Amino acid sequence: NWSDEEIKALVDEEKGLLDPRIFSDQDLYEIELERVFARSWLLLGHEGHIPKAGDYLTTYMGEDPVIVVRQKDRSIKVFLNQCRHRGMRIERSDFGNAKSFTCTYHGWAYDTAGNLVNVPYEKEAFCDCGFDKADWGPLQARVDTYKGLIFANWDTEAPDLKTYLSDATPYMDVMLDRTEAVTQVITGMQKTVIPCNWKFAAEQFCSDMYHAGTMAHLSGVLSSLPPEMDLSQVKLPSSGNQFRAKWGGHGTGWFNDDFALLQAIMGPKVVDYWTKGPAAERAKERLGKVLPADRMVAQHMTIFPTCSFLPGINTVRTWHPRGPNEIEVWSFIVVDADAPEDIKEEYRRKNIFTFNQGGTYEQDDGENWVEVQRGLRGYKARSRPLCAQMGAGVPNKNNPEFPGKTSYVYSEEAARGFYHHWSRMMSEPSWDTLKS
Amino acid sequence: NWSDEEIKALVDEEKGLLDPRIFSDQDLYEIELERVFARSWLLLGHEGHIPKAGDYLTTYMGEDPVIVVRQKDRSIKVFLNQCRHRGMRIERSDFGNAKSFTCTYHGWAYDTAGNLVNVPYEKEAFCDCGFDKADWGPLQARVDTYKGLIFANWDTEAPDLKTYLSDATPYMDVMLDRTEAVTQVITGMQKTVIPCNWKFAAEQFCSDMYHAGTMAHLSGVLSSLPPEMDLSQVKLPSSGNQFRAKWGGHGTGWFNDDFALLQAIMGPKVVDYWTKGPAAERAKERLGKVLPADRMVAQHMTIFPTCSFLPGINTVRTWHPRGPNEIEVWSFIVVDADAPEDIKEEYRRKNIFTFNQGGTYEQDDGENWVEVQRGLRGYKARSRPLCAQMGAGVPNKNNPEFPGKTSYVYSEEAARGFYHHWSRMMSEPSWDTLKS
Amino acid sequence: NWSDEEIKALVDEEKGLLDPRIFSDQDLYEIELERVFARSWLLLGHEGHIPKAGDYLTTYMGEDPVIVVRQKDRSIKVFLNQCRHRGMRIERSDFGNAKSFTCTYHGWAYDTAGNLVNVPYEKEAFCDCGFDKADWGPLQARVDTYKGLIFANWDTEAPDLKTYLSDATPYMDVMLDRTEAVTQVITGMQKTVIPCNWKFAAEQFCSDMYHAGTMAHLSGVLSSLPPEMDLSQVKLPSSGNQFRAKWGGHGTGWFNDDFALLQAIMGPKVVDYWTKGPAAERAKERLGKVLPADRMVAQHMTIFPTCSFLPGINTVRTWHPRGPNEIEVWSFIVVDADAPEDIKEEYRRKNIFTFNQGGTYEQDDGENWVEVQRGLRGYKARSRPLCAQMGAGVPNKNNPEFPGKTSYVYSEEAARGFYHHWSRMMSEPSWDTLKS
Amino acid sequence: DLTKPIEWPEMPVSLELQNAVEQFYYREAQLLDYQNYEAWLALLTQDIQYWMPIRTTHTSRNKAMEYVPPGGNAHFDETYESMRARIRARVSGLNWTEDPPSRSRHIVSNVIVRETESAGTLEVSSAFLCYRNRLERMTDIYVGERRDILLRVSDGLGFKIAKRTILLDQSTITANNLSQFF
Amino acid sequence: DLTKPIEWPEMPVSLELQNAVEQFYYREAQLLDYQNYEAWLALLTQDIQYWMPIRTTHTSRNKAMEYVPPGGNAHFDETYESMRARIRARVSGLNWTEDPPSRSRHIVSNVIVRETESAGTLEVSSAFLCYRNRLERMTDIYVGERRDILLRVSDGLGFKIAKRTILLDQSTITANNLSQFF
Amino acid sequence: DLTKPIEWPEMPVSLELQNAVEQFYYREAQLLDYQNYEAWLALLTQDIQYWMPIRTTHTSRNKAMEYVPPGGNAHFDETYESMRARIRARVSGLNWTEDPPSRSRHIVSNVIVRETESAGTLEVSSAFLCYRNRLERMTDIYVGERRDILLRVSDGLGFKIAKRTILLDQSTITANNLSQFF
């Protein structure tokens, strides 16, 4: 099978070369579940998904189903949605409020913390004791949040969430920390299946503004523009930058100053709320302390490995892996809690129209990934590296005004960082070296 | 790949721990076909399926299609339903009466014994002889029966059927040896597909009364009870035992004395025939010689690896493997040959209503297996052992009145034996050690 | 995994024994893509598919999608239908005429030769140059033709097409070189999916007249005969031969002199054009120089590995591999360019009626392959060799009147050659030995 | 003889009758798709024989052996009370296989009516495609034909099902299970 | 309440009305299947609310939680102008996901009509199976029910869709995407 | 032009005609599903042109290139006698691909009728979903549209198929084969 050396060689961070096999190899996928998904901080949802004690949500961490539930002390617990007796799914509903969880196979019952509290006929069948319910509760995951977003990680040796986020938080704040009131999540999570590798999706949201700046969304722009306006009336701004996290593979890109571009997508109502008035001013006050967030347009971002969102548009989603050739997209919409109700409604409708499966933008996104995955069946198609050198080693593309390593809006520096960190998690057994 | 030592370690017979991977690993599945299915005695059907000379049935032995046909001398032959020329299926009908079998690819014809008797243009194309039809007949399997049930095994080094059955025959007799007249099989075999590992099904019928005694069939009981009776009016008996075969992994469980439980399922007409009158008395006379069969209620049983049936309810089935994530259930119904016609009819209808795919019991059985299989896609879901220690090492649960190793009705001793024997067949290359 | 020695042992060319695993093993399939498909001359179509400059066709070479396009200088170029940036499919239409090809993911544009001629924002994103479009065009394949048929091969070390065809060209000429006017291809390629290994199909067209001479097409013959004629009125000729290429695994078989057999299939109009008159005489003049082509009836042929056609019937097709258990059949019809229009029409209709998916012959062909593939799931079904010894070492079956190694029409000598060459490509790393 | 179609007339029944039968079936389908099983049960007569025979594979000449005959094993062979009992379990909140409930769609088409010698009694043929989606991504398609004996009544939905024979187009059941009524 | 069927009458509407509605739907389907999106758009009223809610999994007792309520996230929640805008993109020749265009078939059946208190205004239930085939071998099946409010008019095709609520029988979308209108 | 729908009238044909055509199609479907191929063949005119063109993938602008034109290769391009010949093979007991026979269901819907200038001659559009199950677990779904020219007659089933053009919604045939007539 695969040696760490061979794995590390699959990605050339310097020249910017990607071995196509990382997107199709089944063995590498199994390794990803172990070395990537089982030890990364993964997006599970938003605090607004489980506001009250007992409220729960069933989702995934890689391909492991998990239950996310609010505790009475307001903390959040996340554990494997699998009964240790014979492996039955403990909770089969999508969400709700519970006082307990029961496995219907043999009746093993659990409390909202995931403790096995009742085993039918325990004294008659397990004793005459050598059996202790305390030893058989489903695996617990570490849980933390970052301004509304809930993350989980199974690895007790991994760095805490904040540390993990490296120097990428200021960029996340653009969407999550605009007000002291926090963000709310619109009710309703959309789940869809796409036959492609998770890396294509996560990478795109991490470093690929290029597809949007070229041909991928010409039809999407036409759909979101006013009927009297056409493409010739839209100048794609020449000025934007991209950020690569110091550590972790996170990334984000954006255009500078020209909000007409964001307005071409979200409309004037959303853009004005985002750029003019008390709300916008309040945001500049908070965000300006770390970066010139007020000039960022149509920002795209990915928190390694599968947490992606678009500040300004406000769609958020987790890419759940389903083997090397498939994923599930679980998306939701966030809005400022104190935003005017008509602004929240506008964000809801614009999101459904654009970045929801069925939207005028999202559908063209999957179109490329799907075609790429199909082609990887070919032997020659997997025999030569993909070109990820855009801007590699090219000077004078950074913008010191923004914190961290930056480059031009059309660049693959962030992508290079994305795949490089991937290669590291995949080839480094211990956090002793990985956390560095 | 897998070493015998690693394989054997997948099951801890003493502590009662099962590595989840035995249910999902593809490599282990391939090994099962070689070390388990290719050398075990497998249920093919009942003698009543092929009563007359020339009568045949097409079924499986693992994933190998085979033809089962009655010979003129009354013996039964079983051979691979694959033409050795290019591998075409020889007989594509489900059953019938034949005077010969013909491969329609190139016309190679066979007699009812599986001998290649005609090769078109043999003298013109194969000779000028170095070709002998006698050397090219499809692989033959060893065939034997046990009171009506037909079994087959490819391995000439394996122990004979009776020996293989170890000390489990008295328990099989409860359903198969109630009268000197033998049993008959109701016409019509039901075949269905279920996306789960065969071990979950076989194990359940081998040692899992626990699911039925708890939550799995609360709705099934409601469906089979009279309209005026509800669950509160059904006392689940506290008294029952379970048997673990001395060798082989066979197992069976049952409740003691309270036939009201069996009546809640099969109705009073069936129960009275089973417990009162000449038939019941005649059965006690035969069975009582080896065990107190007259007190056994709602018995469940599995003959390793995939032969399962429920004495009293009388559903019988073979679980055909279809990779680690799927199986086919081929079931049929047996009845005492001299039983009153109205009793045979009652057994037919009750079986269709309860343990047929679509029945009020069977559907909830697959529900658990299916959910369990889905969860095994997760890495963490496959990283910790499943709990199979119920009653392990716990004294005072046996009942010497029954022959062999016994324990409480709610126990996993039989299951432990099931998986232990599985681990042995999987890790022991030669019958020199395996037959011990 | 597999050693060259173990691979070579899968086929016994002398005794005529085939290990069933060559048709089902996934690992061996991956090796086929590397050692067979990636270095063989593969049929892509006919020159008539892309007559004008800029005309293109999208097809496959193994599982690698490729674009086949006519150049201005009349030459033909074939390159991978995969953009080296992120792997997107460059051309998604089936055929047409183009002035350029554009990847819609990020807009990389190509000329009709496959050169990357435009990269959006090249100077702004890739430079400040270390990036050269000249280094990133999709992989080019070697391209050559043989009297109308277009072939391609990725391996620059492989022998040229003509050499590769060995001594099999005279047999190919029977269909392709009947006139100085060349052949034309009827508009419309039929594409269908069949769940079987490509070897069963290619082998059959290479050496299996036996299935047609026995039971496989009894219904097909009934469908193509006049209503007043039945099977008893059709004498299957006893006289025919088969050719095995000196090198390469190519093969072809046919019946001698009795054209009533071909007329039973294609009708009198086609047969008379093929055997009587100026056209037939003109053909004898050209073909007779190398072989007695005028006596060949219902000829079947395969050019290793996946190029098959039936001279006289004139159906041509490529078997595209899709894993060990599936293939796609891409067929078309060729006719003499100067043939009377009513003759071309007759060939069109007869072909649709017989050897098109849905035809009275073709459907029964796949029926056998499909059943064979299903059976290979069985362990025992894959444990013993298939019988390929028909005529092996049997003297007095050749006919010196025909060039090369020949045997009886019902023979597996060609098949033996087919599998033997397969075993060689699979076990011999370098052309240094393989070309011998 | 299930290997031959019902004896439908060459000239079809009246527009009024054709529409009433189709409209009845569409409503029946709605009851199943919205889980109103009790209202559905009410459409069956006390004498109902709800049967779905096992189908087997044989050569065309041996087609008489395709269907497991009456009195043999079957997928369904029900009476009004057995259906009632199945319904009791279905709506109990304890039938795990159907709780959470499936999302189904009972499409009905190709309705052909035959008027019997008994006024008000009809024999009807209709094709069905029952779509079923459950849990997260489980999807199944059940296709076949239903042969009914319907009694036209003056109340309810205008008809009652006195007999239903389901010809499911499958030998081995390929679906995950048979939790849906057809 | 989407968890209960529309209140269709026990006695079905007239033959004339039943046929007009079905014939209207079959024509609508043809417009979608032949990509005449503009003519299709013309069948919707300016007040149209084209909505396809997200459906979730819960126990039968908690079925009231199945549908994400109005005002929440959804697969589709459109107006006449948003549909017009989607159409603009679809026929632009730049909507890669649908160019090359899919080969679709919008099968409609089980048409049940309810006459409201407003003359000319109807509430209609109908099952649909939208087949979609694209590229080389991509195939998807979308099955569900459409609940419409139709206005009978004297011109055009005789009806206009004033409201459409699509109950897609899926929780997680199993298809490759939702590029088709229903 | 197969890239545009038949010219159906905005106002649909009479109830009587609509029902006769649908009832004819449902009966035709029954003949295929019960393997009475001879009776089926009898529904075609001697001049029948049974054609199922090959469909290809192109951008919407190049949609005129979708269908392989008449005179080109095709899946089916039959005459009355070629169909008769195919039938001869089908019922011979030697057509292995269909013996054992498949279990099929020919669902028909979306029937739209157009009255031509010739009395008694109609052009009809209808969607079809042909389900096919065979051997142990082989299952295929064929979906498309049939465009027929029907002649209304006074005997038989009331109609005869003078021409059928099948628009199968697929480019590459994804099914195992095309052993079924549509």
Ligand code: FES
């Ligand atoms: S699997 Fe949960 S109690 Fe048995």
Ligand code: FES
């Ligand atoms: S495969 Fe059976 S005769 Fe050839």
Ligand code: FES
């Ligand atoms: S993948 Fe082709 S331009 Fe990016």
Ligand SMILES: [Fe+2]
């Ligand atoms: Fe995008």
Ligand SMILES: [Fe+2]
């Ligand atoms: Fe059970």
Ligand SMILES: [Fe+2]
């Ligand atoms: Fe053939």
